[PDB]
């Protein structure tokens, strides 16, 4: 007990220590990024001990260490939940973040604000571990809004760029739309269950859990960029490449998925919520993998890749497999962070070139980036016995052999083929063929920071699915009896995607020029959703914000009915009273009329 809880809190306090160092400073640091990276590698090592002694005995606890506030019957404490989800997610996040920061010591080396960048990246990591280690909804909401704000500040890192500020505010907007559902869930649990703690929520176990689960699904739709609230995650590629690698691929954007994994005792007893999550995840994983088939910016392709993988995670929550969804989070972190780091290696070697039509011939010119990009694309598409095999193949086998929305299953399989198609789109245009980049070749990947940071996620992308899937305890019963066409569905669908997109890629070399279809323009212009909804919904708001609300009501009509008409009335009465002609005759005639009205008409003499 005393080892577990101490090293648990030492990991988090250790992460807070470089924030205290950078806020209490006077000098120019002797490599503050190296200090933050050393701190996070040490927090990874320190977090591995409670993880190992969870793997040994299943040892879980709750550290409710500081009573913060008692609102009459709601005692709010600083409470940390050290269960399976925290025990696996904290080392994976720390390992990925340690690779992201050794990558950032190379990629952000020219940045004059590199200490502020490492400060913001560590503040993200602190808010994310506050999110995943939380036991009550208030502390989870602290972590939730904290990763939203660090997402804002890191998307708009180059703040003089208008597109960076627009993408950062768009990410805020969609996440606050999801926070509506988060606060709906908190309101429902407080009013109906008198708690924000997970233990009393799970122990009371309400049957009428439609409305709080709809709130949690809306919160995950915002945070994990599911369909309807999806385009902020491809817009979030406006930030620097380590931001996209850490936050917007592997760690932040699974949080909504993580939220629904955290409330699995409620979702497992609600078939309606499961069907909503299933249809929403299948819609997301179809639509975003379809959008990725025609993109040309490499970070947009990897962003639609990870939003399709989040849709797959939402699917496997929707088939009542939350531990496979969490396994796919912990698996997806390695190869997707590595795919963004390989893309950033290509982008830096080609002088901030991000379009895949100005790449090519990088198989031999960037051999280590090529090796790791091929290993990551095979881990993404579910090559057998790489890390993506140990989660995604089980997800497809469980989605096949279950009482399932059949259209959601079929769209999940079409999305699985589309993953192979856009992965070989990356490999074909970036690595194969002949060069299309400019003539002054500055291709160099010989930094130890770049090589070692991609190397550790490469060892992760080879072996981490095997190691994690053989260390985690069984929490469900795995379906292992199924017909041969249904066992072999994922591999055959992935191979068909590779074959079909080899045909698509070899047709690009032919000397034929076809006009683009409407299917190409639908995939390329993102299903027309950021074109319509980001023009129409701001327009109708902002006109309503100025014409109706500002001008018509609170400059005109609320000004007209109380003060202006009163003022004009008193002015008019003032001018009628003071328009007397100064004639004694008329005043005494009014006095006579006064006396006659008082006597005959008012009877003031009786």
């Amino acid at each position: 007990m005393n080892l577990f809880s101490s090293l648990t809190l030492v990991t988090l306090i250790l992460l807070t220590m470089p924030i205290a160092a950078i806020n209490f400073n006077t000098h120019k640091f002797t490599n503050y990024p190296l200090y933050v990276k050393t701190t996070i590698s040490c927090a990874f090592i320190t977090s591995m001990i409670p993880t190992m002694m969870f793997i040994h005995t299943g040892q879980e606890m709750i550290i409710s260490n500081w009573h913060w506030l008692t609102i009459q019957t709601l005692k709010l404490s600083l409470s940390f939940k050290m269960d399976f989800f925290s025990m696996m997610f904290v080392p994976v996040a720390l390992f990925v973040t340690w690779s992201i920061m050794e990558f950032s010591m190379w990629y952000m080396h020219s940045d004059p604000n590199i200490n502020q960048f490492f400060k913001y990246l560590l503040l993200f990591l602190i808010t994310m571990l506050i999110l995943v280690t939380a036991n009550n909804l208030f502390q989870l909401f602290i972590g939730w809004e904290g990763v939203g704000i660090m997402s804002f500040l890191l998307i708009g890192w180059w703040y003089g760029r208008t597109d960076a500020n627009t993408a950062a505010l768009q990410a805020i907007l969609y996440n606050r739309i999801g926070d509506i559902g988060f606060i709906l869930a908190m309101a429902w649990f407080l009013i109906n269950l008198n708690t924000w703690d997970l233990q009393q929520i799970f122990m009371l176990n309400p049957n009428d859990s439609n409305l709080p689960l709809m709130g949690l699904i809306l919160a995950a739709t915002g945070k994990s960029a599911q369909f309807g609230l999806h385009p902020w995650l491809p817009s979030a590629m406006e930030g620097p490449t380590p931001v996209s690698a850490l936050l917007h691929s592997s760690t932040m954007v699974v949080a909504g998925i993580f939220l629904l994994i955290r409330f699995y005792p409620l979702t497992e007893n609600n078939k309606f919520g499961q069907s909503i999550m299933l249809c929403l995840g299948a819609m997301t994983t179809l639509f975003t993998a379809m959008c990725a088939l025609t993109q040309n910016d490499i970070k947009k392709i990897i962003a639609f890749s990870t939003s399709s993988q989040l849709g797959l995670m939402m699917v496997t929550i929707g088939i009542n497999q939350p531990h496979l969804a969490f396994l796919h989070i912990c698996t997806h972190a390695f190869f997707k962070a590595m795919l963004f780091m390989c893309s950033g290696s290509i982008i830096h070697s080609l002088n901030d070139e991000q379009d895949i039509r100005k790449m090519g011939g990088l198989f031999k010119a960037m051999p280590f980036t090529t090796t790791a990009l091929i290993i990551g694309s095979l881990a993404l598409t579910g090559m057998p016995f790489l890390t993506g095999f140990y989660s995604k193949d089980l997800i497809i086998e469980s989605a096949n052999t279950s009482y399932t929305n059949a259209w959601a299953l079929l769209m999940t399989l079409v999305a699985t083929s589309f993953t192979a198609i856009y992965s070989t789109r990356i490999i074909f245009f970036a690595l194969l063929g002949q060069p299309r980049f400019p003539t002054l070749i500055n291709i160099n990947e010989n930094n130890p920071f770049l090589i070692n940071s991609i190397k550790r996620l490469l060892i992760g992308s080879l072996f981490a699915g095997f190691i994690i899937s053989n260390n985690i305890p069984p929490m469900t019963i795995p379906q292992m009896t199924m017909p041969h066409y249904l066992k072999m569905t994922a591999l055959t669908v992935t191979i068909l995607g590779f074959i079909l997109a080899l045909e698509i890629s070899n047709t690009t070399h032919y000397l034929k020029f076809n006009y683009p279809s409407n299917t190409f323009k639908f995939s390329n212009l993102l299903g027309y959703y950021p074109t319509i909804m980001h023009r129409l919904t701001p327009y109708m708001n902002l006109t309503m914000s100025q014409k109706s609300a500002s001008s018509l009501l609170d400059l005109i009509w609320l000004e007209t009915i109380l003060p202006k008409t009163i003022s004009l009335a008193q002015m008019k009465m003032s001018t009628t009273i003071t328009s007397q002609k100064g004639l004694i005759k008329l005043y005494f005639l009014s006095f006579l009329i006064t006396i006659l009205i008082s006597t005959t008409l008012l009877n003031f003499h009786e």
């Binding site: 019957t73 407080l190 009013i191 109906n192 009371l204 023009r535 129409l536 327009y539 400059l555």
Partner: protein, 128 residues
């Protein structure tokens, strides 16, 4: 042949597809040259102040001041109560108030009836 571009409010017509872009008439040349003259005069008036070494402050733009004065202070002197402003001021001013009044009133009447009839599940509700 080709699908004709249909311009919308939020997707305007391109410059290269506009038929008035190819007007070579002398009155359009005079209008374009007069707009260039106004823009060049405003440009010179700006950058004689912008490049002044003795100037330290804000080059005031009367167009910006004129915009911010039109957006706030000129609105009520140019308001006339007529059919349009009254029917828009009452639709968007008291319309939503009536709407949300009946929504919240119907919801709370239904909920109060369920509570006093013992039907609303209020089992663990002690925070309010």
């Amino acid at each position: 042949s080709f699908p004709k571009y249909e311009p919308s409010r939020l997707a305007s017509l391109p410059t290269t597809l506009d038929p008035a872009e190819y007007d070579i008439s002398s009155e359009t040349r005079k209008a374009q040259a007069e707009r260039l003259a106004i823009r060049s005069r405003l440009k010179r008036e700006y950058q004689l102040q912008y490049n002044d070494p003795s100037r330290r402050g804000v080059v005031e733009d009367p167009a910006l001041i004129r915009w911010t004065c039109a957006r706030s202070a000129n609105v009520y002197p140019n308001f006339r109560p007529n059919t349009k402003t009254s029917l828009l001021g009452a639709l968007f001013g008291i319309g939503p108030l009536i709407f949300w009044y009946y929504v919240f009133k119907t919801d709370r009447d239904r909920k109060e009836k369920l509570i006093q009839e013992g039907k609303l599940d209020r089992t663990f509700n002690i925070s309010y």
